[PDB]
Design a binder for this molecule. Structure first.
Ligand code: NI
Ligand code: NI
Ligand code: NI
Length: 926
C-alpha cells in the first residue's frame, strides 16, 4: 500500500551514488552516471570491438535489428547497478566520508530509511525481474533472465531463493524507492533511445548466461577512474548534469579505455589469402596444411574440426588458416590459442604475431605484443615499462569481500593474471583458462563471453586427458551453443574420443541431424557442421615415415643407465631424459653429475636440469640455455644431456639425438618421442651411434610378470593406464611411424582387454587398477553437480551454478581444479631471504609485507616467484597467511612469502625446504 504522489516522482536522479572515494579522493560518482558509463562501454563495444558474427547472432537471438539489440544490451548492462538505489546500499557509507549528508539528502526526498543489508546485485535482480515487464514491456521470462544474468555481475548469478524469498523488503524498499528506480531506469532508457523501439526477446538461457559476462566486463571498464573520473567533486554537493551530454563524454572515455586495452581496432580488411601468403616462411605446404586449405573453402560459420597428424607436421598453420577463414569469410574476428597445461605460452606468441601482420595493419605491433600474452615475462616487462600500463580498478563493490577496494583488486586480477589473455580479440594462453569456463567458479560467464567472440584453437590434445576427464566435452557443448568455431589439434585420438567430442559440440549446437561420422585413414581431418559432416584422409609426409628402435632399461640397469648413456654418448650427441616428477629428475641429475662433469661450448656444464620448480628468473635462464642448445636454429653442442620433467614434453621446440623417458600413458610417451630427431637439418651432424632414432623407456621393477610402478608416477598418472601402456610396449623392438602412433594409442585406450595369458597376480593387478580407475570416473560423474556448471540445455537461468556462490571469492585453482583434475593443486610462493627488519630480496633490500608493492618492487617479487606442487608441503604452505599488503595487490594477491636463511634452508611443516642453485626448490625430511 504505497501510493506515491507527484512530489515523490520529482526526486532528482543525481543524488544517488554508485561509487565513493576514500582518502585523497573526496569525490563520488552518481549512480545514473555509472549506469550511463557502463551503457556507453557497451555501445562502444558493439561499435568498435565485437565481431560481426557475434552481433548478427545475438541480434537474431534477441529477435530485433542490430541498432535495437545494441541499445537494449546497453540498457541491461547499464541497469546492472539499479539495486544500488536502495536504502541498504545508499546507507552503506562510512561516517567519515559523509554518510549523514547522503542520509539527509534521501530524507529530503521523502525516502524511508532502513538499516537492513543485502547485496546490490541481488536487489537489482529483484527489481528488474518485475520492472522490466511491468514498465518496459518485456515478457516475464525475458525480464527474469535479464534480471538474474545482470544481477550476477559481481561473481555469481543469484540463486532463486536469494531473490524471491530470503530478500528482506526493508533492504530493497518500496513505494518511493520503486519510483526512484523507475525514474533512473526511464532516464537511462530515454538516453539510449529505447522508446518506442520493438521489445527484444531474451529467453535463451546460455545467451543470457554469457551476456552476464559482458555485463561484468563493461562494469570493469567503467570502474577505471583514470578513464572514468567521478562526476561529483565533493560529498557536499550534488552535480547538475545533462544525461545526454554526459553519455557522449562517457562514450569518448569508454573508447579511450578500451583503446588502451588494445581491443580496437582489429578490422580484417578482406582480403582472401592462401596459406603460402599468410605464412611466407613455408615453401611447399605439408599435406595436412593442403587438406586444411582445401577444407577452408567450404567451412561453415559454426563448426568443429579435428586435426590428427604426426607431430612436426605443422598442424598449427592449418588451424590458424582455418581461424583466418572464419574471421575473414564468416565474421569471426578473433582467436584464442589454447596451449597445453605444462606448456609455457612463450615460443608460440611470435607465430601469431607474424600471422597478424599479414592480416592487419601494423597497429598489431602496438597491441598484441603486450596484451595477447599470458606469460609472466610480458607482465614483468610491462611493469618495468613506464608509464602505468596496467589497467586499474577502484570502487568494485563486491558483496563478500571486506571492502570495495579489495573487490577492485580481485576484479583487477583479470588485468594482471594469466586469464587476462582471454580478454583481447587475439590471445595466447593455457587451455586451463578456457576449461575453467565450465567449472563452478567466480565469473565463469566472463570466460564464456570472452570465448564467445573468438574462434578457439585447442593445441596438442591428448587421448589420456579426454579419457580421464569431461572438461573438454562440456566446454565443447557450451561452445556449440554459442556458435564458436573450434579447431582441435592432436597427434592422434581414439575414434571413441573423436565421436564423443564431436557429439558434444553437436549437442551444444542443437544439430538434430544424427547421421554418422565418416571413417578415414590416419592422418586425418574430421569436420562437422549443420548439414555437413566430413572425414578427410591425407598422406603422411615422407619424413614422418621412420622406424624408431625401442629399448628398455630395467631396474637392475637403472644405475647402469649412466653407464648406458656413457657408451651411447661416447662419441657425443644430444640426449634428453624425461622424468614424471621433479624429485625423480633432481635425483637422476644428482646421480648423473659424476658421469658427465664436463663443460659444453656455451660455457655451461653439459649436464643440465629443467623443471618448473625454480624461482622465475632462474627458469628464464635455464630455458634460454636449453633453447640455445636444442632448438632448430640453435648452436648445437657436441655433447649435452638434459634431465627434465614434462615441461619439455609439451612446450619447447627441441631436437634430441637420443630420448629416454619414464613409462607414461602411450600418447604422452609418443608426444615426448616427437622431440626425437625432430629437425632434419640436424641429421648430417648427428653422431654415428645415434643416427638411427632410439627411444629408451625406464622399465618398472618386475616381479615375475607383474610391473611395480614407482610411487611418483603412480600418483601422477592412472595406474591402470600405466599398465596398459607397459603391456602395449613391453614386447616391442621397433615402432613403425606414422601408423604405430594411432595403432598404439588405439590399442591402449580403445577397447581390448588383453591380459594375454599370464599370472594370476597380473590379472589381479589389471582388475584392481581398472576398478580403481572406474571408481574415480564414476565418483567424478556423481559429484558433477558440485563441480561443473550446467550444460547449455539447462531449463533456467538460475542454478547453472550452485555453491559456493558469492563466498567470496572461492577457488578455482587450489580446490575445484584438482577434484576435476584440470591441473595439479599448487601454492604460489615468493622466495626471499631472512634478516632483521623482516624478509629481504636476495640482494638485498627489505620487503614491506604490510603494504601493497609498487610496480617495480612487484616486478622484483614476481621474479622470485615459484609454483610449489609437492604434496608433502602443500598444506603447511597454505597455512601461511598471505601478507596484508599483498592481499590488497592485484599483482601479488594469493602469493605466500617463503623465507630461506643464509644456508638456503626454511622450515615448512615437518619438512625442510631448500633452495638449491642446481636442483631448484628441494623438499626433504630432516
Ligand atoms: Ni555492482
Ligand atoms: Ni557497477
Ligand atoms: Ni560496481
Amino acid at each position: 500500500g504505497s501510493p506515491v504522489g507527484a512530489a515523490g516522482w520529482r526526486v532528482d536522479p543525481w543524488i544517488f551514488w554508485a561509487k565513493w572515494g576514500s582518502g585523497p579522493d573526496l569525490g563520488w560518482h552518481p549512480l545514473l552516471c555509472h549506469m550511463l558509463d557502463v551503457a556507453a562501454v557497451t555501445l562502444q563495444m558493439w561499435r568498435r570491438v565485437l565481431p560481426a558474427a557475434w552481433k548478427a547472432r545475438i541480434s537474431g537471438v534477441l529477435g530485433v535489428g542490430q541498432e535495437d539489440a545494441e541499445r537494449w544490451l546497453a540498457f541491461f548492462a547499464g541497469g546492472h547497478d539499479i539495486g544500488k538505489a536502495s536504502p541498504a546500499f545508499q546507507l552503506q557509507l562510512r561516517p567519515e566520508q559523509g554518510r549523514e549528508l547522503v542520509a539527509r539528502r534521501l530524507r529530503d526526498a521523502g525516502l524511508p530509511l532502513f538499516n537492513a543489508r543485502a547485496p546490490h546485485g541481488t536487489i537489482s535482480a529483484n527489481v528488474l525481474e518485475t520492472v522490466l515487464a511491468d514498465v518496459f514491456g518485456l515478457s516475464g521470462r525475458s525480464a527474469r533472465w535479464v534480471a538474474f544474468a545482470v544481477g550476477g555481475h559481481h561473481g555469481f548469478v543469484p540463486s532463486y531463493d536469494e531473490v524471491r524469498r530470503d530478500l528482506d523488503q526493508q533492504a530493497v524498499g518500496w513505494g518511493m524507492w520503486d519510483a526512484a528506480r523507475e525514474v533512473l531506469l526511464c532516464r537511462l532508457a530515454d538516453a539510449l533511445g529505447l522508446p518506442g523501439s520493438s521489445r527484444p526477446t531474451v529467453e535463451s538461457t546460455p545467451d543470457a548466461f554469457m551476456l552476464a559476462g559482458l555485463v561484468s566486463v563493461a562494469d570493469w571498464i567503467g570502474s577505471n577512474e583514470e578513464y572514468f573520473p567521478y562526476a561529483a567533486q565533493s560529498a557536499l554537493q550534488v552535480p547538475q548534469l545533462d544525461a545526454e551530454a554526459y553519455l557522449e563524454r562517457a562514450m569518448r572515455q569508454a573508447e579511450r579505455a578500451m583503446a588502451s586495452l588494445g581491443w580496437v581496432g582489429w578490422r580484417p580488411a578482406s582480403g582472401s589469402m592462401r596459406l603460402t601468403e599468410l605464412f611466407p616462411y613455408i615453401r611447399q605446404p605439408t599435406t595436412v596444411q593442403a587438406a586444411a586449405e582445401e577444407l577452408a573453402g567450404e567451412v561453415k560459420s559454426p563448426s568443429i574440426t579435428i586435426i590428427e597428424a604426426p607431430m612436426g607436421e605443422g598442424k598449427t598453420e592449418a588451424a590458424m588458416l582455418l581461424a583466418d577463414t572464419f574471421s575473414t569469410a564468416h565474421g569471426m574476428s578473433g582467436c584464442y590459442f589454447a596451449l597445453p597445461t605444462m606448456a609455457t605460452s612463450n615460443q608460440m606468441f611470435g607465430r601469431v604475431t607474424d600471422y597478424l601482420r599479414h592480416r592487419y595493419p601494423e597497429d598489431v605491433v602496438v597491441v598484441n605484443l603486450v596484451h595477447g600474452h599470458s606469460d609472466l615475462s610480458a607482465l614483468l616487462q610491462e611493469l618495468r615499462q613506464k608509464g602505468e600500463e596496467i589497467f586499474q580498478l577502484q570502487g568494485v563493490y563486491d558483496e563478500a569481500l571486506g571492502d570495495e577496494q579489495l573487490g577492485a583488486v580481485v576484479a583487477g586480477q583479470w588485468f594482471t593474471r594469466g586469464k587476462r589473455a582471454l580478454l583481447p580479440p587475439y590471445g595466447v594462453g593455457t587451455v586451463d583458462q578456457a576449461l575453467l569456463a565450465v567449472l563452478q567458479v567466480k565469473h565463469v560467464f566472463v570466460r564464456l563471453f570472452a570465448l564467445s567472440t573468438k574462434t578457439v584453437i585447442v593445441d596438442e590434445v591428448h587421448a589420456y586427458d579426454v579419457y580421464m576427464t569431461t572438461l573438454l566435452h562440456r566446454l565443447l557443448e557450451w561452445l556449440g551453443a554459442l556458435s564458436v568455431p573450434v579447431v582441435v589439434l592432436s597427434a592422434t585420438l581414439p575414434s571413441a574420443r573423436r565421436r564423443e567430442l564431436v557429439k558434444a559440440y553437436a549437442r551444444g549446437a542443437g544439430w538434430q541431424a544424427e547421421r554418422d561420422l565418416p571413417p578415414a585413414g590416419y592422418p586425418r581431418i574430421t569436420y562437422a557442421a549443420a548439414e555437413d559432416v566430413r572425414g578427410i584422409h591425407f598422406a603422411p609426409s615422407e619424413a614422418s615415415r621412420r622406424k624408431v628402435a625401442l629399448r628398455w632399461v630395467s631396474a637392475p640397469e637403472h644405475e647402469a643407465l649412466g653407464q648406458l648413456l656413457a657408451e651411447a654418448l661416447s662419441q657425443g650427441g644430444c640426449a634428453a631424459i624425461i622424468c614424471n616428477t621433479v624429485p625423480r629428475a633432481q635425483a637422476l641429475y644428482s646421480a648423473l653429475r659424476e658421469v658427465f662433469p664436463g663443460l659444453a661450448e656455451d660455457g655451461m656444464p653439459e649436464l643440465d636440469l629443467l623443471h618448473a620448480r625454480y624461482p622465475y628468473e632462474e627458469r628464464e635462464v635455464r630455458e634460454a640455455r636449453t633453447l640455445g642448445r636444442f632448438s632448430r636454429n640453435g648452436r648445437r653442442p657436441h655433447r649435452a644431456i638434459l634431465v627434465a620433467t614434462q615441461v619439455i614434453e609439451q612446450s619447447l621446440d627441441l631436437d634430441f639425438d637420443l630420448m629416454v623417458t619414464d613409462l607414461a600413458p602411450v600418447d604422452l610417451v609418443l608426444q615426448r618421442m616427437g622431440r626425437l630427431h625432430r629437425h632434419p637439418v640436424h641429421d648430417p651432424l648427428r653422431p654415428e651411434r645415434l643416427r638411427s632414432p632410439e627411444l629408451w623407456v625406464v622399465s618398472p621393477q618386475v616381479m615375475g610378470d607383474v610391473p611395480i610402478f614407482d610411487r611418483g608416477s603412480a600418483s601422477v598418472y592412472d595406474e591402470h593406464t600405466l599398465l596398459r601402456s607397459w603391456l602395449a610396449l613391453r614386447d616391442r623392438d621397433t615402432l613403425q611411424l606414422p601408423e604405430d602412433i594411432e595403432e598404439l594409442v588405439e590399442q591402449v585406450y580403445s577397447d581390448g582387454r588383453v591380459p594375454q595369458g599370464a599370472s594370476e597376480e597380473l590379472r589381479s593387478l589389471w582388475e584392481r587398477t581398472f576398478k580403481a580407475q572406474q571408481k574415480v570416473l564414476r565418483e567424478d560423474s556423481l559429484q558433477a553437480k558440485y563441480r561443473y556448471i550446467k550444460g547449455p540445455g539447462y531449463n533456467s537461468i538460475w542454478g547453472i551454478v550452485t555453491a559456493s556462490v558469492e563466498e567470496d571469492a572461492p577457488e578455482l585453482h587450489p580446490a575445484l581444479q584438482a577434484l576435476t583434475r584440470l591441473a595439479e593443486p599448487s601454492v604460489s610462493a615468493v622466495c626471499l631471504v631472512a634478516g632483521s627488519g623482516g624478509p629481504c630480496l636476495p640482494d638485498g633490500t627489505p620487503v614491506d609485507l604490510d603494504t601493497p608493492p609498487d610496480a617495480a618492487m612487484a616486478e622484483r617479487l614476481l621474479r622470485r616467484s615459484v609454483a610449489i606442487t609437492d604434496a608433502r608441503v602443500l598444506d603447511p604452505l597454505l597455512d601461511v597467511p598471505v601478507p596484508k599488503g599483498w592481499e590488497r595487490s592485484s599483482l601479488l594477491r594469493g602469493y605466500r612469502p617463503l623465507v630461506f636463511d643464509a644456508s638456503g634452508r626454511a622450515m615448512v611443516g615437518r619438512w625442510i625446504v631448500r633452495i638449491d642453485p642446481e636442483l631448484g626448490i628441494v623438499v626433504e625430511s630432516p
